[PDB]
């Protein structure tokens, strides 16, 4: 990645072990996970596309995973060369060629011609592109070893209601769908599958206008709610 | 090693005992294979002679291997003597000797006659060479110590098509052949030795076809497929 | 039959016996097969119907397939004459005489008239005439002799796919069928007279397998004698 | 077929018979076969499309076969036919009709109007272009008739070495390999698939060998005679 | 293949299939017999390279023989590459562009570059250059076929000189042998283990005689192959 940023924004510094073994240990664990994101993000913030493969190819399991996500790059540099008509060398001489996308996603582009248009005035962004590849991909992933299941869960019996809004809050988040059918699964699918005596209390007070009532209300069906698991 | 933090200037900086308590504990546990090889490369990046050789005998283990890649290093010290000549001419103050394969490898050089090549104008690539011929050394052990032949490879009687091509890449990354061969075993033993059923759907498919529609095939073949437990 | 130039000088030569020998060969092995009928399309360029009803004189063996091609012309020369337009005559200076099914045939015009008529820009062209009516009834001879039915064909129950695909597509090129039902006949017939066992896996390739793994199926249930040797 | 003449116009030469009757006859002994495929080019020189349908559809057995061929020229047609439009652009008195891909397969246009874009300067080159979705087609069929598994295949114990040698490179020239794999096919399964006796000789003697060095190896398993065993 | 004088103003015209199916007869009835190579010389007179090649791949058969033909072609193309080291390159006014030992193997030569050093001045004729190299190649296999076993050809007292004549001049021939060789192996194998009452007769003709009069020596010796002699 970049470093010295207050002295310069120029001078490199290769990807980190520490760095590496903290994604490592993110793409055993918690790969498929919508959380995945932002720590990937902040952790590849100011990352070359030599940083952002090298991340990537570190990676000892899940290499099928590894395999989409470079699927989904070639598929975006592919679509970058049917946007884009770029020319060879320079079309204005005095500055620099127009990079493809395979300089984009590191093949035919050295550290230094890598850095030499995040360096160059005005800047061109070539792991700012490439970063949002492997977002797409991370999305992608967080979808196929991982799909919601939001109609299979629900409160059973003996089930407490706020870990069952937890739940689905964050099924929710994994969601990708559009917001008028996940609004249908705040204002119908969570009432509907609700244990009948949390159902009075949602049909009630509208869960698109109030939940901090909902953490007070509703505490016998699993029981007593300072006896709970996550305190 | 040496670091860099502002524009034209190398400075060195002394080898951690971290440093090197993490490497040691890699190697322990996983050896040589693949999620150590760019690992180490991002470990000894700015390294010198001095420190590679301080990271190939600080191990205590798989000596087998070490010694393979002995064999190796020096194999090529003694190639860099066929193709160039031995530095034999007198040498004074303000004139450096021309490396040979030996001072390469920091076997009969002393560190500031290694620092004064590398931090030069325009810098000789003394500790680049090193890393490369240990890079390629440990791609010689991997090799060998690569337990699975993939010609006799086959999907287990309950097990998953998601499973099966990610246990099959995983297996193909540290088999020998140039990756055209790789490409063949991966179009011909996943269709064939997949179970029976799935090897008609990537019939039906093609062989030829795209990864994510690869991947998507074949489930419930064994039983029901599964998904990652984060939800 | 004449000789082409560019000079318009159109000469006329009879009929090469060399023409005729190689031809008396092939109606003897070949005059019921689906072979014979470009066959004699490709020895009969230029043709006159001079040389048209010589050909036809050569044959000794095989007079019912002949006669009932000699039927089926002279119900087109018949056609022809119906079609014709009664008693145009004579009423333009260096105008040709409209053609009849008897001048086709070579009946009532003379060889000399005849190559006038097809040496005319653009033709009158009366040998083709003559060549399209004998090969429409070299079809119906194909049709009425050769195995054309597509509900008695059928696979035996260790009989390979091979022969089978083979002698289906032998039977459907002397059937006709508009290619809407021709395309329903490869699709539903050809999979359903198959045998149980190959009928499963070409129920799983169906109409999404490529033709190169379609009608190559069922060799693992076929065995040695559906495999092939290498010679 | 056609001969150029007289600055650039063509004739016809119909056919010879002799031509004929051993084209046929090579279909008839030989099917589609490795052979077959440079004699129909040879056929395939110096005509128009309307005669190679005519050398084409003289095949009365292999029809199966056929129907793959001819599907693959039904399916390239399509190709040619959505690449370049028909009449759409620029447009005067004296051109010509500009070609579909019916009119390359010979199906939509007449015999001096396939002629008449290659006697045209810049001259357009229907018969080549027909010619290639033929031999394209033709070796696809060379693979029909060779083994489905070339991993799987072994030299049983008591069986020639010479029949063998013979075997995998009838195989490797059906399969039509990758460079990278073709080189190493002939480096290790031809090895290791050897029989265990055959095996000791070709292990030791390598394969930098000589062909007529490494064809006299292995005449051990033949056992002592008068004969040799490489015959 | 190439039609008038070669050193005139040569003309070249398309591949007869006529020429490619008689080769291929003769290949198939006769195999590489010494009445068959003398044909392929007669052929190759006026072949180019592209023709020479088609030739070698119109033979389906005989694999492991053909492969140690393109093997010991390129033998001789290497030796040829090295021997004859490329001039120049490319001249405007001067040769096109020079041929090396592959472009005369047609491995890297297209026909305009064939048919272009031949319509130079000097003509250089690749395939006559080509012609030999091929013919080793036929030759190669049938030395293959022939023992090479001295102690096994050797004369002996029962058996008739007629029968040595097969036995001798196949293992002699099965390479070069110098004066000097012959002299040693006539006495050695044949004359010294004659019939004691014909020793002393072919020991004063010595084994530089005629083997004719070797032949019809033994005139009034009674014994073992007297009644099997010409004379």
Redesign the interface.
Known sequence: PI??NL??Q????????RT?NAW?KVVEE????PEVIPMFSALSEGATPQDLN?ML????????????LK?TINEEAAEWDRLHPVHAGPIEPGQMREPRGSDIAGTTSTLQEQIGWMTHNPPIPVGEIYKRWIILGLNKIVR??????ILDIRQGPKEPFRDYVD?FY??LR?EQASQEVKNWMTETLLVQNANPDCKTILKALGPAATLEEMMTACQGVGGPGHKARVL
Chains 1, 2, 3, 4, 5 share one sequence.
Not at 30 to 33: D, I, N, P
Not at 144 to 149: A, E, G
Request: net charge positive; glycine share 8%; hydrophobic share 40%.
């Open positions: 470093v010295q002295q310069g120029m001078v490199h510094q290769a990807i980190s072990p590496l490592v918690k790969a498929f996970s090298t190819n570190t990676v000892g399991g899940h290499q099928a995973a590894m395999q989409m699927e196929m070893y991982s799909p919601t299941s739940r964050k099924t994994a």
